[PDB]
Amino acid sequence: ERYENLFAQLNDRREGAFVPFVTLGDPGIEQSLKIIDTLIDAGADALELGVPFSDPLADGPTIQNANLRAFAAGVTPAQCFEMLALIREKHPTIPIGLLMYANLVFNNGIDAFYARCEQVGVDSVLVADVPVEESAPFRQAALRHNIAPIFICPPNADDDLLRQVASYGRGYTYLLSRSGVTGAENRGALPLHHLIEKLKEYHAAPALQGFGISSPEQVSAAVRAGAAGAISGSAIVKIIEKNLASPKQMLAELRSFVSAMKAASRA
Amino acid sequence: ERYENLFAQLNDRREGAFVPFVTLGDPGIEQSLKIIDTLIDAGADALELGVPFSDPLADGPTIQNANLRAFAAGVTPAQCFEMLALIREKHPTIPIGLLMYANLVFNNGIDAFYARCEQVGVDSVLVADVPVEESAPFRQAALRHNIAPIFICPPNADDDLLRQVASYGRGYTYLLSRSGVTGAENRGALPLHHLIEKLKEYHAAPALQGFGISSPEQVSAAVRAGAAGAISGSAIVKIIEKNLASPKQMLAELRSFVSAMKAASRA
Amino acid sequence: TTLLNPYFGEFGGMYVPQILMPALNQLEEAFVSAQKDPEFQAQFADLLKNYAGRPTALTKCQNITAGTRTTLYLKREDLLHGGAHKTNQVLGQALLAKRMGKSEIIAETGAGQHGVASALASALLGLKCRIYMGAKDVERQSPNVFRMRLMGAEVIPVHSGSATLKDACNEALRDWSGSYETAHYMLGTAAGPHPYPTIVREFQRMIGEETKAQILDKEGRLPDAVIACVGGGSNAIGMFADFINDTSVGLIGVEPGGHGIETGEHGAPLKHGRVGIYFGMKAPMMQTADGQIEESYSISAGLDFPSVGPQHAYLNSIGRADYVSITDDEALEAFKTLCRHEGIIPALESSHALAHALKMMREQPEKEQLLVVNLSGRGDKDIFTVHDILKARGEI
Amino acid sequence: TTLLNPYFGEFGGMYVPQILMPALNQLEEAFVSAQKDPEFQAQFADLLKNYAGRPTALTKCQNITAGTRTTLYLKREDLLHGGAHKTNQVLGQALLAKRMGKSEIIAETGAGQHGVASALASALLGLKCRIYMGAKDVERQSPNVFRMRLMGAEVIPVHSGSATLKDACNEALRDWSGSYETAHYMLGTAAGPHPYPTIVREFQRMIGEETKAQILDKEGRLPDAVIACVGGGSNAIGMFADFINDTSVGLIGVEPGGHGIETGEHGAPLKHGRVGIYFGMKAPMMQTADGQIEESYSISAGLDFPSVGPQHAYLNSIGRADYVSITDDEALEAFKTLCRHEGIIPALESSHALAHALKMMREQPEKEQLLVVNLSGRGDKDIFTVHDILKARGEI
Ligand SMILES: Cc1[nH+]cc(COP(=O)(O)O)c(/C=[NH+]/[C-](C[C@]2(O)C(=O)Nc3ccccc32)C(=O)O)c1[O-]
Ligand SMILES: Cc1[nH+]cc(COP(=O)(O)O)c(/C=[NH+]/[C-](C[C@]2(O)C(=O)Nc3ccccc32)C(=O)O)c1[O-]
Ligand SMILES: O=P(O)(O)OC[C@@H](O)CO
Ligand SMILES: O=P(O)(O)OC[C@@H](O)CO
Ligand code: NA
Ligand code: NA
């Protein structure tokens, strides 16, 4: 599958993965598609993609405002799935992961949601407000439709939680940089070496560190500590927010940022 | 004494008494003196005179505003006594009664207050907020200084109260037209014949009816019912209030009103 | 002729126009009869318990006394229905009014607390209630005015004089003097002509009775002192009454010092006035040299009255009770301290009593003393007054 | 793995980001331990009695039921310190927070009642309190905001979404997800992730326990029904809990109908929404066809929440409890009726429950029925809202 292939290729090249996040449809459907193509062309190894949700309880103001811009353009989950299909048609091998809130997965049937993910070529789904303790119907539906269920390893994880995330997760493990919500200005500085080592000991899916990653130095630190890669969202979205009136400068600044962040993942 | 002489003369002439009330010093000391001389020259048989007090709990808005005008001119009780002395010097026989609030009598000594009344030639004092039940030190001080203590016969008087007012009062008995406070617009219509007859049976001082008396017809009704006379205050004070800017028209309208009210007292 | 003594030493009496003496005599007679009537006592008790919420708590304040040898309890009249002790006596007075066949109620109010209490009792018990309130207080207390009106009371602004409580008092008594056949005057304090000082005390004395029982249960002894603010005297005599014969218990009443006694802008006649005759009673008054009644001042509209009830004047004269004063600024500091350190927002009236207690503690912090402050009401009504002061002073 | 069942049938759970599960597990553990700890129970009881004023009265309303066979009692949580039932559970939750070594408190509020309660408990018990409040509610509730600030709480306006309670809820949970090591989230209702629905019920169940004892004493039997408004579910489950096993006692919850269910402007997810996952729980929600959470509406900011606690959803599903709705106008009429005929100014929240009781009486006036309405708070906070409505409608 796409994650296993990616991480194998990156390991052969002694490379970490750089995985940007954007909200689908921000600031509009067409510009969002151009944005995503620019992120790929600039060196993104995989994608994390959000579906706009009315009450994103795990996101800070930057991604809250991305959702609002998307809603202002009329973006719906159905339109997001049409985008996902187009993205996959253009890019057959890049891993595509969704970051979802539970109600959008549950609303019209858990099984049906994962069936649609499979139809459009999504590789993984992380449900931000479904902990391992509540994940059974989500992970079963994911696996039934060849979707990797993604679980979070938080910095306060105990050994039992480490063993659960290692057993139940697939594709990658989401290693949180810190407590709190998403935010480029809040950089996590707690050393995560111990958690990275336990995950590997327990044969967990390779770890991608996320939350607060906004500079190339943070990407290098994550890979150097043993993570398989790093995720950056708010830092990317701020470039969108800053250049709403200059769509071309937006893409150029996104390319520069992505290229620099990916360069820092190379060892 | 002056009341006994007056009522004897009026009875010989088959006349009731007309007794106007004004507040001393309203609207000023000099105009107040001219007012009082006009009331006498126009036919007043006796005078009732108020000393401005800060909180006149037995007076309606008309006489409240008279007090305020007096205070606005700086009128003090001491100045009121200087006026009383001048009035008596001009008019040796007219009965002069004060309408007082208790604190002004009590403030610097009950005995001293009545001593000053005697010095200036006052004939009687009615303390509006001292009922018979509390009157002992007031009536003793009055009698010691040859001042008649005046008591009120209210329309709800019981027989015991009738016998007390008859025994303790001198000069005249104040027969209330009605409950409430002073006010020319509120005319009392309860028949008072019964109370007038009991007072006479008990040898009370002759009754002067007061409160709400604002027209000659009310004066005639009081005398016809057996009262020795009638008191009118608010109706007089309204003439002052109406003509504050025309001092001469004020005196002319006061003369007309007093003359008509006194005419109605003649049988 | 009266059934009960109208005087407390030199102070008290019935200095009303003669027209009102029968109303006062009827009220006294009805009260004496009601006090002996077990049905009346049972109905009053039922309303106090199941409608107003008696008994009220006695709360120990274990943050404000830290580091001292003062133990401080607050008697929580702020938890009574309506938000203050006034509700106790309005319930009794309304029952007396019905006992006498009266259908209407006249009441005065300052900040609006007695107005609210009168309005709520009249709504419950089927009486037509009209409330006189100084126009300056109306302008500043539009919330309590609307509460009174929501409960069906007529609220009548009074624009005369200082347009505060004394002026509302005057108008209420003028009204009663022409409406006593159908209206009961629900006087709001332990002052005015007999029998009001006695009736109000007896319908407020459960405060001290409960306090005594509660302190005995919690501490096993009587307080060293009980402390209450004094505007007219109701809340203080309700706390004091049951302790008067307990000679070891200090009784401390707190008059408003306003801007400072030396400014003349205060409401402290008991200690800084002189005896006069006004509002139906012989009592200490703020008055001019000539005997005109002076206007009082206090940040607290409920203490803004230039006289005081005669029993307090008497208890002071004989040394049984001691009276002190607390300024606007001292009351404000006590208000803020209780909000922040005990989570209780007290009335600005009651804040005067708390301020004196805090002074008793702070001045002699190693003195062992067990004190009870009568927390006569809650301060929700006062938050706008406090806000504007703190805004003008740059504090917020 | 939990010590207690997180579900009520299909409803409930712990749908929070993984980072918060240890905080929830620690809270559950602390609660289970505290419930078995006689020292904790004694301290909680002492605060409830001597600080908050429990037990609260049960008042019979003998004017509003005239001419019918309805007997109506009101459980007087409006007489609790702070003015509403919220004070019960904040005292328990604050003690839990101290038991867990937390020094700070996060709380959400709508109209400000839970904010005031959280602020007062934090002031008493030495905790640093910060309150999230929708900016539209802040603008309309400046008095309660100032009360919170007087008691030392930080009040943080929330401008996102509808700028009402749901949005304050979101921000509080975002905050907690980065501050749980030092801050306890003092959730204000019987909703959210386990263990909050259970903890809030257990710290509010004295309402029904007292009500049962009081009704047995006065009437010698259980009520035919107990009636409570439902915004999140705390006051209703506190009344219901002790009656659940008394199968003859009807349990009636009243959601806000707002401008009318048919307008979509209401807060009645239990009967007019559908199950979803949000605010940490699986519960009935107002939501779009796509699964976006809808904004609610009610005249009462305390009922303006587009979900409901899971135990109510469960009690409804099995038919043990029945849920209805009451519109803005119906609540306003009940508010006015209680003010004018019983002299009690009720919260606009509680006015929904009273309105349904009045409907039960008026629709079948010869039906013999003994009803208890949970008068969850007083309406002093609401007089400005009511004034502006009555002004706009030309009524005043
Ligand atoms: C919470 C609280 N605590 C203490 C007091 C002080 O009054 P007391 O000295 O205890 O009697 C409170 C005052 N309430 C009143 C004022 C009133 O009492 C009243 O109604 N007529 C009247 C007449 C003369 C003096 C005082 C009063 C109001 O409505 O403004 C109050 O509200
Ligand atoms: C007097 C009174 N009566 C009834 C209620 C209804 O609430 P419940 O359904 O009983 O829980 C009252 C409301 N208070 C709250 C709202 C709050 O409770 C809270 O704080 N967070 C929260 C979260 C979701 C729903 C509801 C709430 C406020 O502060 O605005 C109230 O004030
Ligand atoms: O926004 P940040 O802080 O980069 O967090 C990453 C998150 O947005 C995607 O999982
Ligand atoms: O004002 P009136 O109503 O006339 O009453 C008389 C009174 O003012 C003098 O005793
Ligand atoms: Na005073
Ligand atoms: Na709700």
Automatic annotation (TrEMBL), chains A, B:
Its EC number is 4.2.1.20. CDD domains: Tryptophan_synthase_alpha. The active site is at residues 48, 59. Pathway: Amino-acid biosynthesis; L-tryptophan biosynthesis; L-tryptophan from chorismate: step 5/5. Keywords: Amino-acid biosynthesis, Aromatic amino acid biosynthesis, Lyase, Tryptophan biosynthesis. Coiled coil: none annotated. GO terms for cellular component: cytosol. InterPro entries: Aldolase_TIM, RibuloseP-bd_barrel, Trp_synthase_alpha_AS, Trp_synthase_suA. Signal peptide: none annotated. PROSITE patterns: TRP_SYNTHASE_ALPHA. It comes from the Bacteria. It holds the Pfam family Trp_syntA. It catalyses: (1S,2R)-1-C-(indol-3-yl)glycerol 3-phosphate + L-serine = D-glyceraldehyde 3-phosphate + L-tryptophan + H2O. Gene3D superfamilies: Aldolase class I. Belongs to the TrpA family. The alpha subunit is responsible for the aldol cleavage of indoleglycerol phosphate to indole and glyceraldehyde 3-phosphate. NCBIfam families: trpA. Tetramer of two alpha and two beta chains. This is Tryptophan synthase alpha chain.
